[PDB]
Design a binder for this molecule. Structure first.
Ligand code: YV8
Ligand code: ZN
Ligand code: ZN
Length: 232
């Protein structure tokens, strides 16, 4: 009923949307992984009379439920999707999207890592993002490659009309006590990558992590802090 929906509040298989700003929503779903349940976020950005999707809802059935929830709550077609790194919480559901008419995109680095890992593979490659600090426009957002952090391929997304910074899994929520799933992370480079984000998007008003609650710019410094302590 209005607060940001939380892990214990969403059954696995249901999706909820949360209005972030005019024409910007997050999507929230839950999934089981190695015997524990986790929430995860994505983004929806209005693109005239179409929608741009950032990240799947972590699985095929969750992503089908996402499309149904978008049609119920918004009623505009999802035409393009971008996955911000290669893990299942970002690409799991790409096959569902591709069968629902959605053109799926990711960097070549993400596509290679997804293919090598056995994860679902976005169709189209996003060039122009291979060097840290690179930025490209994609509909109503800017895509930014900050450098290696949670993964070597992680992208962040900025919505300039609303000053919304979607950090994806390179950014953690304020309540976090460690750096999440660090399997593919570069803990040494992560603070430098976060510093690049801070320098590039100083006017961000909302910061959305890959998992958990949105907040303000403090999420970036908090992320650096929990990562530095995890490495140590
Ligand atoms: C699918 C993904 C994956 C699965 C399960 C959990 C997560 C978490 C995660 C964990 C804890 C917290 C709370 S907290 C900040 O307080 O610790 C959190 F917010 C997020 C993340 C993430 O941190 O983004 N991602 C996960 N996977 C799988 C892949 C490894 C595959 C190797 N066989 O790597 C990866 O990330
Ligand atoms: Zn990940
Ligand atoms: Zn993640």
């Amino acid at each position: 009923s209005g607060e940001y929906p939380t892990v214990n509040e969403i059954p696995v298989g249901e999706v909820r949307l949360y209005q972030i700003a005019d024409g910007v929503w997050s999507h929230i779903a839950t999934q089981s992984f190695d015997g524990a349940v986790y929430p995860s976020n994505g983004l929806i950005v209005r693109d005239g009379d179409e929608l741009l999707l950032i990240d799947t809802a972590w699985g095929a059935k969750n992503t089908a439920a996402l499309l149904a929830e978008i049609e119920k709550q918004i009623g505009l077609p999802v035409t393009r999707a971008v996955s911000t790194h290669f893990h299942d919480d970002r690409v799991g559901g790409v096959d569902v999207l591709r069968a629902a008419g959605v053109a799926t995109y990711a960097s070549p680095s993400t596509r290679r890592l997804a293919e090598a890992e056995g994860n679902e593979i976005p169709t189209h490659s996003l060039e122009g993002l291979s060097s840290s600090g690179d930025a490209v426009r994609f509909g109503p957002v800017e895509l930014f490659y900050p450098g290696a952090a949670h993964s070597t391929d992680n992208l962040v997304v900025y919505v300039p009309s609303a000053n919304v910074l979607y950090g994806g899994c390179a950014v953690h929520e304020l309540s976090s006590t460690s750096a999440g799933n660090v399997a593919d992370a570069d803990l040494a480079e992560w603070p430098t990558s976060v510093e690049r984000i801070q320098k590039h998007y100083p006017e961000a008003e909302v910061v959305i992590p890959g998992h958990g609650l949105p907040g303000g710019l403090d999420l970036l410094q908090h992320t650096a802090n929990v990562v530095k302590a995890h490495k140590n």
